[PDB]
Design a protein around this ligand. Structure first.
Ligand code: CL
Ligand code: CL
Ligand code: GD
Ligand code: GD
Ligand code: GD
Ligand code: GD
Ligand code: GD
Ligand code: GD
Ligand code: GD
Ligand code: GD
Ligand code: GD
Ligand code: GD
Ligand code: GD
Length: 258
């Protein structure tokens, strides 16, 4: 017929057309998280919004390189250098550095997480922004691995509300990727979630990430409808807008018919 029929039973992911000044990159908020607390980040409510009930440590904006790869120091014979986790051995040393004299189980201070001086050993962070699909079709987001706990949410009223990026987190636990650290221990690699997206609409995107001890890891990718993969550097795909709670037409509940 003259018009597309629309995704079945309001199935389309909600998106946005914010009218304000677009900024390259995502906003990163940092929140307090306790060293060796392996239980707090196992709860859906905590990972969706509860993190923001803890002390906010700071923020950085305009981040396009969004993967996390934090390595603890090895205090070695030849100085102090970051140790790739797969190179750690024994009790303990780091391959090519010898034995390390420092503890794996204390807090360490570093700017490795987006240049913000904090404790990547123990912290929770919230990345927010809008994903701009250049192509219409199925997009598959993935975490290659999760160390320690993480979620990824896409869509208006799922990640956050349109034109309200900077507001307190919404309560939705309808995660696109659920990488929450299981209670019973365990969890596989290459965890994934798929969203059908219409080109040129801005899709709210939230990533919440937490680490309790030592190494922290979150390699983020998206496979595009053309089958190519974008990993780590999402420049050209992720943007921020200052809140405009007064922009009435900002929410597009169904981009398939808009
Ligand atoms: Cl180091
Ligand atoms: Cl060695
Ligand atoms: Gd990176
Ligand atoms: Gd980089
Ligand atoms: Gd890093
Ligand atoms: Gd870094
Ligand atoms: Gd690095
Ligand atoms: Gd880096
Ligand atoms: Gd909503
Ligand atoms: Gd960790
Ligand atoms: Gd594919
Ligand atoms: Gd890098
Ligand atoms: Gd603002």
């Amino acid at each position: 017929g003259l018009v597309p029929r629309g995704s079945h039973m309001s199935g389309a992911t909600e998106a946005c057309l914010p009218a304000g000044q677009r900024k390259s990159g995502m906003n990163i908020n940092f929140y307090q998280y306790s060293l060796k607390d392996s239980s707090t980040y196992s709860n859906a409510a905590y990972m969706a919004y509860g993190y923001a009930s803890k002390t906010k440590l700071g923020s950085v904006g305009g981040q396009t390189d969004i993967s996390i790869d934090y390595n603890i120091p090895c205090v070695s014979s030849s100085g102090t250098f970051p140790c790739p986790q797969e190179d750690s051995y024994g009790n303990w040393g780091c391959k090519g550095m010898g034995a390390c004299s420092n503890s794996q189980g204390i807090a360490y201070w570093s700017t490795d997480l987006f240049g913000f001086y904090t404790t990547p050993t123990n912290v929770t962070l919230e990345m927010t922004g809008y994903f701009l699909p250049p192509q219409t079709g199925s997009y598959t987001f993935s975490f290659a691995t999760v160390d320690d706990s993480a979620i990824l949410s896409v869509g208006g009223s799922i990640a956050f509300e349109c034109c309200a990026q900077e507001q307190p987190p919404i309560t939705s636990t309808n995660f696109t990727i659920n990488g929450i650290k299981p209670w019973d221990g365990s969890l596989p690699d290459n965890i994934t979630g798929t969203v059908y997206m219409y080109a040129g609409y801005y899709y709210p995107l939230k990533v919440v990430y937490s680490n309790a001890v030592s190494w922290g890891t979150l390699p983020i990718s998206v496979e595009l409808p053309d089958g190519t993969t974008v990993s780590d550097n999402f420049e050209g795909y992720v943007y921020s807008f200052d809140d405009d709670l007064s922009q009435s037409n900002c929410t597009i509940p169904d981009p398939s018919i808009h």
